[PDB]
Amino acid sequence: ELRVGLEESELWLRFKELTNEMIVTKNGRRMFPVLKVNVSGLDPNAMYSFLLDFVAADNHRWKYVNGEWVPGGKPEPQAPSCVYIHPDSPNFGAHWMKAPVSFSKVKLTNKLNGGGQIMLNSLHKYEPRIHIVRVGGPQRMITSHCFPETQFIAVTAYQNEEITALKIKYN
Numbered sequence: 001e002l003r004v005g006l007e008e009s010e011l012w013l014r015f016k017e018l019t020n021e022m023i024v025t026k027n028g029r030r031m032f033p034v035l036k037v038n039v040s041g042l043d044p045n046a047m048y049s050f051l052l053d054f055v056a057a058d059n060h061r062w063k064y065v066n067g068e069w070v071p072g073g074k075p076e077p078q079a080p081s082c083v084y085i086h087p088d089s090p091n092f093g094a095h096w097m098k099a100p101v102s103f104s105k106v107k108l109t110n111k112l113n114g115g116g117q118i119m120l121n122s123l124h125k126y127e128p129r130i131h132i133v134r135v136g137g138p139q140r141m142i143t144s145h146c147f148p149e150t151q152f153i154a155v156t157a158y159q160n161e162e163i164t165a166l167k168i169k170y171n
């Protein structure tokens, strides 16, 4: 059975309980914390690519009002984000299962940009999601996993200083 688990969930939960924020910039900003995923139950000898994308958790624009995050009243459809390919991809089941799969190099932007960077809408709430794509084999296969613990609002600067403090304390 293919098992997908979040490394350092206790750390992510500290951020989640304050409402997590991730900086987006024109040129793209790396995430902290970094999404790290424990994977077991792969075929050590089969071939897989690991894909990361961001689901809009709701259709609303958020705003920090009197020290609290609040949704707008005017929802809009949120197009799914573009996918980031883990740079170790493609690779053998054994490679992926030998240490936590770390997305340390993904960069979050607010501008349609060249290559690599994933564009997110500022002040939208997002839920990180991976796809494990079996490649090369005759039977293509995808398994998807969401990480509720890693939800965040995309921001151009931190609103909640409690988040600023946690980011510095644990970097």
Ligand SMILES: CN(C)C(=O)N1CCOC[C@]12CCOC2
Pocket: 049, 085, 089, 090, 133, 135
């Ligand atoms: C680019 N890359 C390293 C890939 O893994 N490729 C190859 C080209 O695009 C499709 C996929 C994405 C996952 O399935 C195969």
